[PDB]
């Protein structure tokens, strides 16, 4: 049970602050841990080919005529 | 070098304006923002019948006492009523300035309506209405107002229907008196040999405590009217001459292009043919009142219409200069006489809220050229539906299609 406060910053219990920082910090540990172990958020890990560098031999573009 | 019109305001709200000049015959006058526009068809002749009775008997001056006083100093007592304003004015000497103001105070408050007097007036008003029909141009302008402002309080007349005149109760009158005679809607205007400080003193002593509070907060309010293009054709072939008025909607008091429209009227066959710019608040009727024998109304209409279009399409600088010179000689001033100057103040404080000096009028006249005149005339005359009122042998007066269509030149 807590006490009503008038025009003052409600007093906070030890647990309220620790649990809150706990959940948030694990969120950040998880984001950092996965980013390091699995950074395929960017680039996936397969590079897009430049469709405009395929030698005409590659695609079967006959010699014009 | 014209002396400025100085305006003060009393707690009551009534505005005790004034003006001063070498003259010694001042015209003191109370103007009230109360006319037939503020009546609600159950008291359509209350302002007129109070005007007829106001002079005849006041509580302090019983019976004809007032008219005696006014005789004793040789002063002249006049009153008039329009659709928007009521005026009670006295022309007197300068040295009789206090008592005149006191007399005016009685006339606006402490007035006594003797039920007997009420009756006597009923006769006077009814009979005159019964003979007023004689004045044709009044009949034609009333018909024009009725057909142009159908369904609004601006169609009715200052006189009001005969019925309302017959049926009036000291109490009804009392109401109109106690309702539309409020101090903030009142101007005490003085012109001529008067001092403003002396008039301001006199104002408080005799014109203070003018009512200002309405009953149960039945604070009146007003309706922007509609201009219903329509015609009225009172045919009576026994009359020797025909009177025809054609008008369009006017801009109002506060719209400055009125000045330009006045110049247009100054630019403008059938006997009398006067142009007019009736301008009520928030609306008016620009137009013409031409009398004519039955066989020439037709042509006249065409001529009139022609002139207008010419002013919408082919206005030149020479006729604009002539109209400006003609307007600049309608300026009201001490040379116009006190009563006229008196009246202006009252109307200027009631309508504009201030007295517009003649230098500002001259500036607004000289800024008018031909291009803005034909622009404003095309705004107000070209392709507009007019209101037509005819009285007399008006069979050859064209009907509404010929008039309206004539308002647009197929050649522009």
């Amino acid at each position: 049970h807590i006490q009503p406060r008038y025009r003052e910053f409600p007093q906070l219990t030890r647990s309220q602050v620790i649990q809150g920082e706990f959940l948030s910090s694990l969120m950040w540990f998880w984001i950092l841990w996965r980013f390091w172990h699995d950074s395929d958020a960017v680039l996936g890990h397969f590079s897009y080919p430049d469709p405009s560098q395929w030698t005409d031999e590659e695609l079967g573009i006959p010699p014009d005529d | 070098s014209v002396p400025e019109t100085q305006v003060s305001i009393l707690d009551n709200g009534l505005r005790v304006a004034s003006e001063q000049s070498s003259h010694a015959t001042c015209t003191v006058g109370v103007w009230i923002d109360a006319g037939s526009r503020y009546e609600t068809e159950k008291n359509n002749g209350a302002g007129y019948f109070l005007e007829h009775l106001a002079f005849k008997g006041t509580k302090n001056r019983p019976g004809n006492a007032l008219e005696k006083e006014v005789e004793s100093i040789g002063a002249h007592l006049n009153a008039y009523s329009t659709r928007e304003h009521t005026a009670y004015l006295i022309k007197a000497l300068s040295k009789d300035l206090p008592k005149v103001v006191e007399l005016l105070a009685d006339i606006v408050q402490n007035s006594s309506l003797e039920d007997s007097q009420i009756e006597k007036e009923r006769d006077v008003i009814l009979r005159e209405m019964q003979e007023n029909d004689a004045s044709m141009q009044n009949v034609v302008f009333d018909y024009l107002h009725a057909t142009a402002f159908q369904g609004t309080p601006l169609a009715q007349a200052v006189e009001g229907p005969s019925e309302n005149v017959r049926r009036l109760s000291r109490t009804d009158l009392t109401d109109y008196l106690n309702r539309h005679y409020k101090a903030p809607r009142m101007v005490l205007a003085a012109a001529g040999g008067v001092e403003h400080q002396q008039l301001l003193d006199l104002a408080q002593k005799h014109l203070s405590s003018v009512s200002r509070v309405y009953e149960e907060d039945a604070v009146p309010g007003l309706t922007p009217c509609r201009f219903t293009g329509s015609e009225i054709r009172h045919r009576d072939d026994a009359l020797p001459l025909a009177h025809v008025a054609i008008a369009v909607e006017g801009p109002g008091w506060a719209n400055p292009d009125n000045v330009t429209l006045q110049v247009a009227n100054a630019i403008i066959l059938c006997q009398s043919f006067q142009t007019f710019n009736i301008s009520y608040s928030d609306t008016g009727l620009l137009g013409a009142h031409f009398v004519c024998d039955a066989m020439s109304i037709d042509d006249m209409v065409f001529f009139l219409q022609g002139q207008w279009m010419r002013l919408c399409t082919s206005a030149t600088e020479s006729e604009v200069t002539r109209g400006k010179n003609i307007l600049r000689n309608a300026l009201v001033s001490h040379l116009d006489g006190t009563t006229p100057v008196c009246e202006d103040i009252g109307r200027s404080l009631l309508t504009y809220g201030r007295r517009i000096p003649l230098a500002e009028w001259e500036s607004r006249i000289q800024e008018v050229d031909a291009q803005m005149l034909r622009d404003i005339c095309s705004k107000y005359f070209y392709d507009q539906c007019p209101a037509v009122a005819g009285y007399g042998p008006i069979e050859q007066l064209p009907d509404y299609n010929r008039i309206r269509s004539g308002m647009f030149w197929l050649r522009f």
């Binding site: - | 707690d11 009551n12 709200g13 409020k182 903030p184 809607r185 200002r212 309405y214 149960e216 907060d217 604070v219 009146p220 309010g221």
Partner: protein, 178 residues
């Protein structure tokens, strides 16, 4: 909700009740506080001027153009408090406001418990019947001498008499039954 509605509204109460809707509809636009408290003392200015207009006509022409300025400059979702109309918690705890004339059909077993409760309840019901006569008579002896009647009801005016038509302003189901 307590006092009775006046027949017609004055000029004042119409102006002074805009000062409320207006300022309260300015705190939906100004979500913050310093911005609000600022933009509002500027509002009063608007009402502060044109305070002494004596020209009624004018006054009712500033009011009529104020309430149209306001209607077009109002917030669609203003801040209406809970327990106030429209907003939530308005009729929330009304499911639990039973009307108190229902404890009269309770089984003698139920009312057996809660014993002192009904001992005081029977006192109050004696108060109610003990004055209906002096009340209605009061309501009548003090009746209007004219057809002008407002819903306002009279106070007591004598010792022992219970200010009238009171059984339902007192004995009202409590607001939060919880």
């Amino acid at each position: 909700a307590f006092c009775a509605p006046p027949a017609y509204l004055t000029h004042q109460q119409k102006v002074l009740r805009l000062y409320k809707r207006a300022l309260r509809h300015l705190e939906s636009w100004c979500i913050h506080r310093d911005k609000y408290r600022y933009f509002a003392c500027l509002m009063r200015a608007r009402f502060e001027e044109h305070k002494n207009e004596k020209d009624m006509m004018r006054a009712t022409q500033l009011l009529r153009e104020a309430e149209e300025e306001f209607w077009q400059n109002q917030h669609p979702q203003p801040y209406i408090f809970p327990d106030s109309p429209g907003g939530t918690s308005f009729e929330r705890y009304e499911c639990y406001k039973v009307p108190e004339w229902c404890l009269d059909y309770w089984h003698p077993s139920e009312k057996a418990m809660y014993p002192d409760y009904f001992s005081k309840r029977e006192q109050w019901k004696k108060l109610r019947m003990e004055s209906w006569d002096r009340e209605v008579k009061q309501l009548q002896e003090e009746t209007s001498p004219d057809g002008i009647m407002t819903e306002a009801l009279p106070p007591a005016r004598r010792e022992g008499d219970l200010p009238p038509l009171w059984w339902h302003i007192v004995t009202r189901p409590r607001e939060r039954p919880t």
